[PDB]
Amino acid sequence: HLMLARQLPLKSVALILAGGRGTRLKDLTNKRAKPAVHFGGKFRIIDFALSNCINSGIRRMGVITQYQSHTLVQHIQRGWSFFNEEMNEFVDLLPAQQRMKGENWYRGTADAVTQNLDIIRRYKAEYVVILAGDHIYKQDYSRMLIDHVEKGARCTVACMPVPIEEASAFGVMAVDENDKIIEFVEKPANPPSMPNDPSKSLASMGIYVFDADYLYELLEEDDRDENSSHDFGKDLIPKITEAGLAYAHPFPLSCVQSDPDAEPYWRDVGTLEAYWKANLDLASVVPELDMYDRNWPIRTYNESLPPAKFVQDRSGSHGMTLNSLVSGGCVISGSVVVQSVLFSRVRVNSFCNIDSAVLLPEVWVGRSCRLRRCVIDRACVIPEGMVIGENAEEDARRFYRSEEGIVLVTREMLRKLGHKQE
Amino acid sequence: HLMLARQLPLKSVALILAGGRGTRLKDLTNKRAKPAVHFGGKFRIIDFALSNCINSGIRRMGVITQYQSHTLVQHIQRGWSFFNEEMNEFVDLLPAQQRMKGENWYRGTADAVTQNLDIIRRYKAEYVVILAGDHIYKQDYSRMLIDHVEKGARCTVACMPVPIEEASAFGVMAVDENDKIIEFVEKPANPPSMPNDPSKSLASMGIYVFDADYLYELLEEDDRDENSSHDFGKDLIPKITEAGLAYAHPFPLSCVQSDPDAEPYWRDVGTLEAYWKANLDLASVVPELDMYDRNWPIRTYNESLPPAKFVQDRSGSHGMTLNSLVSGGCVISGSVVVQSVLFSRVRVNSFCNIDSAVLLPEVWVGRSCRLRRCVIDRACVIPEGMVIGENAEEDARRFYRSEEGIVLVTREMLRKLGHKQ
Amino acid sequence: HLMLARQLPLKSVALILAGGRGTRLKDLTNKRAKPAVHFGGKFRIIDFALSNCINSGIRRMGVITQYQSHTLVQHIQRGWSFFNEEMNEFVDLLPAQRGTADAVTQNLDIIRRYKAEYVVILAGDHIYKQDYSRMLIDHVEKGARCTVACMPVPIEEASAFGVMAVDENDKIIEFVEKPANPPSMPNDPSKSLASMGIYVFDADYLYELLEEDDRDENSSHDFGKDLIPKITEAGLAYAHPFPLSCVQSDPDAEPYWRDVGTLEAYWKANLDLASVVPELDMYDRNWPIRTYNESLPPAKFVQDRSGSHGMTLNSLVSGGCVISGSVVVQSVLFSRVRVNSFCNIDSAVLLPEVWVGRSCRLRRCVIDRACVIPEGMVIGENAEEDARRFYRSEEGIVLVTREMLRKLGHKQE
Amino acid sequence: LMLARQLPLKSVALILAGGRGTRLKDLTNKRAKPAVHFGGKFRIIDFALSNCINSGIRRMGVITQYQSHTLVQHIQRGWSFFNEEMNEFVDLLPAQQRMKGENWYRGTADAVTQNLDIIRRYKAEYVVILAGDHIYKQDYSRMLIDHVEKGARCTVACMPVPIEEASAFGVMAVDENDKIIEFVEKPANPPSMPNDPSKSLASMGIYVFDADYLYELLEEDDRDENSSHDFGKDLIPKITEAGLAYAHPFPLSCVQSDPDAEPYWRDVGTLEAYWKANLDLASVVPELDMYDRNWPIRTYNESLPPAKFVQDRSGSHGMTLNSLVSGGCVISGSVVVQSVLFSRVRVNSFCNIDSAVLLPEVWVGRSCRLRRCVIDRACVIPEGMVIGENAEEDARRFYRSEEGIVLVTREMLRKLGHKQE
Ligand SMILES: Nc1ncnc2c1ncn2[C@@H]1O[C@H](COP(=O)(O)O)[C@@H](O)[C@H]1O
Ligand SMILES: Nc1ncnc2c1ncn2[C@@H]1O[C@H](COP(=O)(O)O)[C@@H](O)[C@H]1O
Ligand SMILES: Nc1ncnc2c1ncn2[C@@H]1O[C@H](COP(=O)(O)O)[C@@H](O)[C@H]1O
Ligand SMILES: Nc1ncnc2c1ncn2[C@@H]1O[C@H](COP(=O)(O)O)[C@@H](O)[C@H]1O
Ligand SMILES: OC[C@H]1O[C@@](CO)(O[C@H]2O[C@H](CO)[C@@H](O)[C@H](O)[C@H]2O)[C@@H](O)[C@@H]1O
């Protein structure tokens, strides 16, 4: 009658690291934090980490923000503020400030947790689950908690093989036959390859399980360390590995997926192309990421919208759709929409051709537009007859064009070109 | 009198009569009350009266149910239970029992209010707004409250000209130069015409404003009256008219509409054909009912659904859509959808042709189906290759077929034909 | 396998039988169902079964209602309507119009669509804390088709319960419903092994069992009288000792469970919360009880008409109360209770909105909703006078309602 | 006709809930002033927000001019029940404290200017500017009517204050039409009111603006090299010079039960004033009526056990005189007089508490005596400690005001060697 599998999440608290400032998504995060980035027609990226907590039995969450992110706070307020504190459940907004240890010496990810240590101790959790709020994945944290307790570990790090050519952006580790971490290097310019596979490196997913009291001591010591950068990957994980108290958790043990024969899904959405790719996956016939799984639902802000409306064009002609998502509030006049994802309240006027495009909420596409392989940002007013995705040189002049050929259009770019955004 | 326009809704309580069976809707109301009938891809009919209350400043509502309406109670529970009683706001579920006065003498709508009189008196309301919960319309009751007080009336009846050929279903009235009601007949077989116009009759909309303490007295007397059918239209309104204390409120004074040049919108959704018509109106290019007006929004249960998904069919071909509404959770594989309204989580498989059809939530349409001029009820599993709307006699044998040719399909009908549900 | 303890509640649905009339509660249930009976200064009885479900991981609940259900439905609407169905959680209001099993059978179409693997049947008119997830594990490990939670009870009151006999494997061997001559437990004649009205069912097995019962013209359609004996004869029923799953702070204490059948038991259970060390711990954050969080002003104590202070001894005073001096002893005051000057209130339960006039003395009594006690009235000191004006139980507990006071000529407006 | 009801619907309220300060001493070391506990169960910002709701203004922007953890959490818990589709919300609008010089602070108007993009999209016709750190009841809809009837571009709520305290306020002079003729912000020598030298006509920091006019004014002010970007110091005098500013006497819209009483308004600037305003609610006849159902104050509805009174260790009863005891409290015997105990306050045996304000989660040890003091959140008072009886000893251990009111925090106790966990 052992109940440990059910008791561990109740004794745990999840801490979601929700963003230090960055700019790898370019203008896409100019006016919004990365965890607040739109995804899947109706979600924001942070919804996945939070929904993973709820579905894993962890109903106490702390979302740590490193600056005043308006749209992230509003999203938490409107879609993640339904809890009753008397039932041992909450979503706390924990403000961190970016602190410097020197003129150009930044304090790290661990410092954001250290600043809020007084509030976190009062949670009286036995286990602390540290999460990155800017990744898209489904994982059962209760299974990782079970693995963490079974191994007698003080710190357990979720791990996953990644292509070695992209491993320099990750913490890379080496483990023994017991999944105990033997070596750990943070963002190596020369990433060690996995034994028996030089094409891959064993990478850290930024997902940790901690003994609570051990984490408090470690942060107290780290805060007083004059040599530390106060970063989980750069400072804390190597130190725990050296003490022999750190273990690895292979992601397939806890990744939640409908098709058991498939590869484990995990997207860090680092580049504009990866973001564009991850959204369009949901529009394909067989998406890699299953969002119709009632057994692991993703919670978000339930926006009240009119049903998607399709009307004849100015010539009275019908519209055509091929492998596309049309969110609520959209109004499409004829046109051709193919391999695309349209967020809420998107207006597509007559005689349009939209192919492999991601249109964020409130986008207004004027008459006779052709958009290909692009991302149209919030509330853009595309002027009539505009063509995007057909002339590489012209696209790069007007907007942002990635090396792979993916175009990003914002209100500021269009206004710069003389197209009114009212 | 400075702040009266704002104070009146705060001193008012709305009673929504939601016991309607709507038998003329046939199997559509076999397992649900008429106020719980689906509409507009994402609403139920009762949402309009309740949203009208909220937008009018009347945040205290009593929904009277004349039996055990499970799905009506659940809808109120899901989408209309967000109120905080300490802020002088609530939506109360007030159960009434259907009572008989004789062998086949049914007590009326007023009896349902009388049964709950103890609870209603405790509201301490100064004005009571009586509403029908089975109609679709937008109205600002605060304008009617101002009109009611300025006229010094004890009872104010919202009225609107209707075609005389349909006026026998309504209470018909005649008014003087001051909007005071002079004559009133309830559901006349030969409806009196308006003096200005023999093509129209001045009809009652079943929407009343009452002086609260006057309403209580009237119901107490009516409960003891051995000659009364205990009905608002058949009994109470004629009595108030005879006393000279009843006044009329022209609907255009308070009807909310985007286009001021248009005709006032009001649908009683009495027949299957009218219900089918009112739904498809929203799919047209310029709908008569504007559901995109942010200035008078309609509140409902905000169901969490995946975005509407369109995928290629088995042959890898695209889909076509013409003047149609596709709600969230739907997944459409190719096919042709024209002049149709699809509610939530409707599944349309490959090679389908759907024309002038209303598909209620969770309908599963199999491969190679053709549906025309029909209403498909909740959770129907249409078997592969089924054709509807092309053979009039065949449709009438399998399902219900309206006089004008509109077909209604339910789970029970398909189960009788041997199609597993 | 290793995740079974967590996955069983997610595959379960709880059905709360909340049509209870509570005949032995007299006027206390004249205008309200027994699950809607006030308790603990701020709760309704049904809150415990529902809170037990939430704390057990069972977030899908069906509340079956029937008699005098207005105040019960409103309570569910106010305090138990915060769920988001997309996260596989709800509290359904299932109206029933023949015994307890018939109410479940009537709603069988809706319940099947829950697609539950296990069904937990609960009585919504009892006060207790239980972890149903532990009972679910025991149900699966025993391979049972039906598991019945059991507890030893004094044999002199065992005729009100279903009594059972079990073997060495907790398999139910004999079962009799409400026996006039209750069999005693082996090795203890002072006690009988009683059923708590709490069952765990294999879902598909329960549906079949209800289908057969509906077609049985000889059945009374009752869980205890009809279904449990049938399962016992087939050898498919098992017993679950309540201490396995009973939730309690003090591990040395006796398992807490109250059916509050009589006015005296209801009065007793309320005053227990006012004692120094209550048997029922309502300060345990590890098993909290959810209810309607009513917005109330903080309890206000003011000087009496003579400018004197007030005295309190082992009492609970809910929000919105305003007490003018007076003496309140061993009492429980619900929300918005007004106690005027020069009053003496001892061993009394005052339900919400009670107005106590000046110079009143109330002892060993329960005053019902919104009663307006006139000035100088004395209750609990003259037995015969109490019995003439109000209801007086055999043990001497007095029940006062607004209707009784109105009959005596005391205005209730 | 319907103007009285339409004006709040066309308005948006901006609550200024930021601005660092230290007039409350350690009381605001770890919380913003709008987040300061009050009345046993409220935070100060609840009044402005409740005034908006009760005035018909359901769209609110709370500007937080820095990172106030406990203020955001309170909004998240008690003011996040809105449905945006029904034209209602409480927005958290982040402002940062901006400098114009080495010690030249940009003012309250700058915080509104920073969020001008978000505010314009509200598409409001009128903007109501509110201070989120004051305690008062006011019907903003009455002030909106007065603003429109006077044809004003800006209307300033005003009231007479004692001239010896008027230097902390904006002081104004008005003509016979309540038009503002002279305005000076925080004068060292405040002008007296005509016909009463004991009083000055003061600004309450409550403004009604024509929305587009305010946006123009803020655009110009953001580009003004001479402006401190403050409503009182910069904007109001500028509008006054143009002759477009009007005054609104507070009694026109102040909400109060007793019509014969003086208008209630507290800025709670000092520890003594804060202590005073709390204890007023514990008196026999409080100046501020918190039992008025017609103007309820909304807050975080925290789930708490009923206030529990138990015998002390010697089995003796407890005594209470003119006190408020919030939910979750557990008092063991003891004597509680003229005090206000917030939620979850634990008072052990043999205690004497007089004229004291005990904030949430305070644990008072055995045999303690507290007088004329405010004990902050979660203080663990050690056994036998005495406060409020020795002025010199009190000033050494804690903070002691001029008037003799003592403030105790967890840090002060831990500094004295008394464990706080
Ligand atoms: N309809 C809109 N028009 C212009 N700006 C907007 C609109 N909606 C949001 N924004 C702003 O654009 C940025 C992106 O916000 P969001 O899409 O909510 O993450 C934020 O600064 C928003 O305030
Ligand atoms: N998916 C479904 N399958 C079968 N019956 C259903 C389904 N959804 C609802 N019902 C039943 O249909 C009746 C009315 O449904 P509705 O008003 O659409 O909720 C009720 O008896 C429901 O229990
Ligand atoms: N203040 C009140 N005055 C009179 N009757 C009431 C009051 N509050 C509730 N009731 C009624 O008393 C009965 C039982 O109330 P309750 O305590 O809510 O279960 C129901 O019929 C209620 O409608
Ligand atoms: N129980 C507690 N013990 C210690 N500090 C607390 C406690 N509750 C809140 N605080 C802190 O006290 C400060 C102000 O609290 P409050 O404004 O009451 O939420 C914040 O820094 C809180 O984190
Ligand atoms: O995950 C968010 C963010 O954290 C950083 C460090 O700032 O990297 C962390 O997470 C990585 C996986 O996402 C780990 O591999 C790494 O060890 C850890 O420091 C950023 O690189 C990343 O975007």
PDB file of N, CA, C and O in Angstrom, chain C residues 81-115:
ATOM      1  N   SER C  81     -17.941  25.294  -7.862  1.00  0.00           N
ATOM      2  CA  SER C  81     -18.090  25.518  -9.298  1.00  0.00           C
ATOM      3  C   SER C  81     -16.907  26.310  -9.840  1.00  0.00           C
ATOM      4  O   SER C  81     -17.060  27.286 -10.578  1.00  0.00           O
ATOM      5  N   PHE C  82     -15.696  25.898  -9.467  1.00  0.00           N
ATOM      6  CA  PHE C  82     -14.471  26.564  -9.894  1.00  0.00           C
ATOM      7  C   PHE C  82     -13.646  25.728 -10.870  1.00  0.00           C
ATOM      8  O   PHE C  82     -12.474  26.045 -11.102  1.00  0.00           O
ATOM      9  N   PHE C  83     -14.224  24.683 -11.451  1.00  0.00           N
ATOM     10  CA  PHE C  83     -13.453  23.699 -12.196  1.00  0.00           C
ATOM     11  C   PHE C  83     -13.369  24.037 -13.681  1.00  0.00           C
ATOM     12  O   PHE C  83     -14.215  24.737 -14.241  1.00  0.00           O
ATOM     13  N   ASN C  84     -12.316  23.518 -14.313  1.00  0.00           N
ATOM     14  CA  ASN C  84     -12.078  23.653 -15.746  1.00  0.00           C
ATOM     15  C   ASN C  84     -12.091  22.254 -16.347  1.00  0.00           C
ATOM     16  O   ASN C  84     -11.153  21.478 -16.138  1.00  0.00           O
ATOM     17  N   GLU C  85     -13.149  21.937 -17.101  1.00  0.00           N
ATOM     18  CA  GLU C  85     -13.346  20.570 -17.576  1.00  0.00           C
ATOM     19  C   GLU C  85     -12.222  20.106 -18.487  1.00  0.00           C
ATOM     20  O   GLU C  85     -11.974  18.900 -18.595  1.00  0.00           O
ATOM     21  N   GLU C  86     -11.539  21.037 -19.162  1.00  0.00           N
ATOM     22  CA  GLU C  86     -10.466  20.639 -20.066  1.00  0.00           C
ATOM     23  C   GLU C  86      -9.308  19.993 -19.318  1.00  0.00           C
ATOM     24  O   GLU C  86      -8.498  19.294 -19.935  1.00  0.00           O
ATOM     25  N   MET C  87      -9.213  20.209 -18.006  1.00  0.00           N
ATOM     26  CA  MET C  87      -8.212  19.559 -17.177  1.00  0.00           C
ATOM     27  C   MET C  87      -8.763  18.320 -16.476  1.00  0.00           C
ATOM     28  O   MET C  87      -8.207  17.892 -15.459  1.00  0.00           O
ATOM     29  N   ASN C  88      -9.849  17.745 -17.004  1.00  0.00           N
ATOM     30  CA  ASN C  88     -10.431  16.499 -16.497  1.00  0.00           C
ATOM     31  C   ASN C  88     -10.895  16.640 -15.046  1.00  0.00           C
ATOM     32  O   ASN C  88     -10.522  15.857 -14.170  1.00  0.00           O
ATOM     33  N   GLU C  89     -11.720  17.655 -14.796  1.00  0.00           N
ATOM     34  CA  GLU C  89     -12.245  17.912 -13.462  1.00  0.00           C
ATOM     35  C   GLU C  89     -13.610  18.576 -13.579  1.00  0.00           C
ATOM     36  O   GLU C  89     -13.818  19.423 -14.453  1.00  0.00           O
ATOM     37  N   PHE C  90     -14.534  18.187 -12.700  1.00  0.00           N
ATOM     38  CA  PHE C  90     -15.876  18.764 -12.692  1.00  0.00           C
ATOM     39  C   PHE C  90     -16.621  18.319 -11.443  1.00  0.00           C
ATOM     40  O   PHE C  90     -16.256  17.334 -10.793  1.00  0.00           O
ATOM     41  N   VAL C  91     -17.673  19.068 -11.118  1.00  0.00           N
ATOM     42  CA  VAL C  91     -18.690  18.669 -10.148  1.00  0.00           C
ATOM     43  C   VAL C  91     -20.036  18.755 -10.858  1.00  0.00           C
ATOM     44  O   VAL C  91     -20.537  19.855 -11.123  1.00  0.00           O
ATOM     45  N   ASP C  92     -20.616  17.601 -11.179  1.00  0.00           N
ATOM     46  CA  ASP C  92     -21.868  17.536 -11.918  1.00  0.00           C
ATOM     47  C   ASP C  92     -23.063  17.470 -10.976  1.00  0.00           C
ATOM     48  O   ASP C  92     -23.045  16.748  -9.975  1.00  0.00           O
ATOM     49  N   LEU C  93     -24.100  18.232 -11.307  1.00  0.00           N
ATOM     50  CA  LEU C  93     -25.385  18.140 -10.621  1.00  0.00           C
ATOM     51  C   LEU C  93     -26.262  17.154 -11.387  1.00  0.00           C
ATOM     52  O   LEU C  93     -26.723  17.449 -12.494  1.00  0.00           O
ATOM     53  N   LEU C  94     -26.485  15.982 -10.792  1.00  0.00           N
ATOM     54  CA  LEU C  94     -27.218  14.875 -11.405  1.00  0.00           C
ATOM     55  C   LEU C  94     -28.569  14.711 -10.724  1.00  0.00           C
ATOM     56  O   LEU C  94     -28.648  14.144  -9.623  1.00  0.00           O
ATOM     57  N   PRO C  95     -29.655  15.201 -11.321  1.00  0.00           N
ATOM     58  CA  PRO C  95     -30.964  15.145 -10.654  1.00  0.00           C
ATOM     59  C   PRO C  95     -31.602  13.766 -10.742  1.00  0.00           C
ATOM     60  O   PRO C  95     -31.697  13.176 -11.820  1.00  0.00           O
ATOM     61  N   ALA C  96     -32.012  13.243  -9.586  1.00  0.00           N
ATOM     62  CA  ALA C  96     -32.790  12.016  -9.495  1.00  0.00           C
ATOM     63  C   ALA C  96     -34.223  12.351  -9.096  1.00  0.00           C
ATOM     64  O   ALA C  96     -34.478  13.354  -8.420  1.00  0.00           O
ATOM     65  N   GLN C  97     -35.156  11.501  -9.516  1.00  0.00           N
ATOM     66  CA  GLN C  97     -36.563  11.686  -9.172  1.00  0.00           C
ATOM     67  C   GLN C  97     -36.913  10.972  -7.867  1.00  0.00           C
ATOM     68  O   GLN C  97     -37.007   9.744  -7.825  1.00  0.00           O
ATOM     69  N   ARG C  98     -38.312   2.732  -4.145  1.00  0.00           N
ATOM     70  CA  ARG C  98     -37.046   2.789  -4.869  1.00  0.00           C
ATOM     71  C   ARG C  98     -35.993   3.537  -4.056  1.00  0.00           C
ATOM     72  O   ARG C  98     -36.277   4.573  -3.452  1.00  0.00           O
ATOM     73  N   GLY C  99     -34.770   3.012  -4.068  1.00  0.00           N
ATOM     74  CA  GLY C  99     -33.743   3.417  -3.128  1.00  0.00           C
ATOM     75  C   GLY C  99     -32.528   4.124  -3.696  1.00  0.00           C
ATOM     76  O   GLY C  99     -32.593   4.788  -4.735  1.00  0.00           O
ATOM     77  N   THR C 100     -31.406   3.986  -2.983  1.00  0.00           N
ATOM     78  CA  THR C 100     -30.180   4.701  -3.325  1.00  0.00           C
ATOM     79  C   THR C 100     -29.614   4.263  -4.673  1.00  0.00           C
ATOM     80  O   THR C 100     -29.096   5.093  -5.430  1.00  0.00           O
ATOM     81  N   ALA C 101     -29.687   2.968  -4.988  1.00  0.00           N
ATOM     82  CA  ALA C 101     -29.136   2.490  -6.253  1.00  0.00           C
ATOM     83  C   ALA C 101     -29.930   3.001  -7.448  1.00  0.00           C
ATOM     84  O   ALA C 101     -29.359   3.206  -8.526  1.00  0.00           O
ATOM     85  N   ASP C 102     -31.237   3.215  -7.277  1.00  0.00           N
ATOM     86  CA  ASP C 102     -32.059   3.701  -8.380  1.00  0.00           C
ATOM     87  C   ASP C 102     -31.623   5.090  -8.829  1.00  0.00           C
ATOM     88  O   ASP C 102     -31.649   5.396 -10.026  1.00  0.00           O
ATOM     89  N   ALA C 103     -31.194   5.935  -7.888  1.00  0.00           N
ATOM     90  CA  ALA C 103     -30.752   7.280  -8.246  1.00  0.00           C
ATOM     91  C   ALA C 103     -29.531   7.239  -9.156  1.00  0.00           C
ATOM     92  O   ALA C 103     -29.395   8.067 -10.064  1.00  0.00           O
ATOM     93  N   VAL C 104     -28.628   6.283  -8.927  1.00  0.00           N
ATOM     94  CA  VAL C 104     -27.477   6.125  -9.811  1.00  0.00           C
ATOM     95  C   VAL C 104     -27.914   5.554 -11.154  1.00  0.00           C
ATOM     96  O   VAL C 104     -27.411   5.955 -12.210  1.00  0.00           O
ATOM     97  N   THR C 105     -28.858   4.611 -11.136  1.00  0.00           N
ATOM     98  CA  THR C 105     -29.319   3.991 -12.374  1.00  0.00           C
ATOM     99  C   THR C 105     -29.984   5.009 -13.297  1.00  0.00           C
ATOM    100  O   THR C 105     -29.831   4.937 -14.522  1.00  0.00           O
ATOM    101  N   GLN C 106     -30.726   5.966 -12.730  1.00  0.00           N
ATOM    102  CA  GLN C 106     -31.418   6.954 -13.555  1.00  0.00           C
ATOM    103  C   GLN C 106     -30.429   7.771 -14.380  1.00  0.00           C
ATOM    104  O   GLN C 106     -30.717   8.146 -15.523  1.00  0.00           O
ATOM    105  N   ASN C 107     -29.258   8.064 -13.813  1.00  0.00           N
ATOM    106  CA  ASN C 107     -28.246   8.871 -14.476  1.00  0.00           C
ATOM    107  C   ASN C 107     -27.183   8.020 -15.163  1.00  0.00           C
ATOM    108  O   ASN C 107     -26.062   8.493 -15.370  1.00  0.00           O
ATOM    109  N   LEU C 108     -27.517   6.779 -15.532  1.00  0.00           N
ATOM    110  CA  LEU C 108     -26.506   5.861 -16.048  1.00  0.00           C
ATOM    111  C   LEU C 108     -25.965   6.305 -17.401  1.00  0.00           C
ATOM    112  O   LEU C 108     -24.789   6.071 -17.697  1.00  0.00           O
ATOM    113  N   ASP C 109     -26.792   6.943 -18.233  1.00  0.00           N
ATOM    114  CA  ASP C 109     -26.311   7.416 -19.529  1.00  0.00           C
ATOM    115  C   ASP C 109     -25.189   8.434 -19.359  1.00  0.00           C
ATOM    116  O   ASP C 109     -24.158   8.359 -20.037  1.00  0.00           O
ATOM    117  N   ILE C 110     -25.378   9.397 -18.455  1.00  0.00           N
ATOM    118  CA  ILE C 110     -24.362  10.418 -18.221  1.00  0.00           C
ATOM    119  C   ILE C 110     -23.111   9.807 -17.601  1.00  0.00           C
ATOM    120  O   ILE C 110     -21.983  10.163 -17.963  1.00  0.00           O
ATOM    121  N   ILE C 111     -23.291   8.871 -16.668  1.00  0.00           N
ATOM    122  CA  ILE C 111     -22.158   8.326 -15.925  1.00  0.00           C
ATOM    123  C   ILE C 111     -21.274   7.469 -16.826  1.00  0.00           C
ATOM    124  O   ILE C 111     -20.044   7.477 -16.695  1.00  0.00           O
ATOM    125  N   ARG C 112     -21.876   6.715 -17.748  1.00  0.00           N
ATOM    126  CA  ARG C 112     -21.080   5.901 -18.662  1.00  0.00           C
ATOM    127  C   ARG C 112     -20.152   6.774 -19.503  1.00  0.00           C
ATOM    128  O   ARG C 112     -19.010   6.393 -19.788  1.00  0.00           O
ATOM    129  N   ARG C 113     -20.629   7.954 -19.909  1.00  0.00           N
ATOM    130  CA  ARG C 113     -19.821   8.847 -20.732  1.00  0.00           C
ATOM    131  C   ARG C 113     -18.636   9.426 -19.971  1.00  0.00           C
ATOM    132  O   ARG C 113     -17.708   9.942 -20.602  1.00  0.00           O
ATOM    133  N   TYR C 114     -18.647   9.363 -18.636  1.00  0.00           N
ATOM    134  CA  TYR C 114     -17.438   9.686 -17.884  1.00  0.00           C
ATOM    135  C   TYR C 114     -16.292   8.761 -18.270  1.00  0.00           C
ATOM    136  O   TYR C 114     -15.122   9.141 -18.153  1.00  0.00           O
ATOM    137  N   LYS C 115     -16.615   7.548 -18.729  1.00  0.00           N
ATOM    138  CA  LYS C 115     -15.621   6.547 -19.122  1.00  0.00           C
ATOM    139  C   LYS C 115     -14.636   6.271 -17.990  1.00  0.00           C
ATOM    140  O   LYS C 115     -13.428   6.156 -18.205  1.00  0.00           O
TER     141      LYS C 115
END
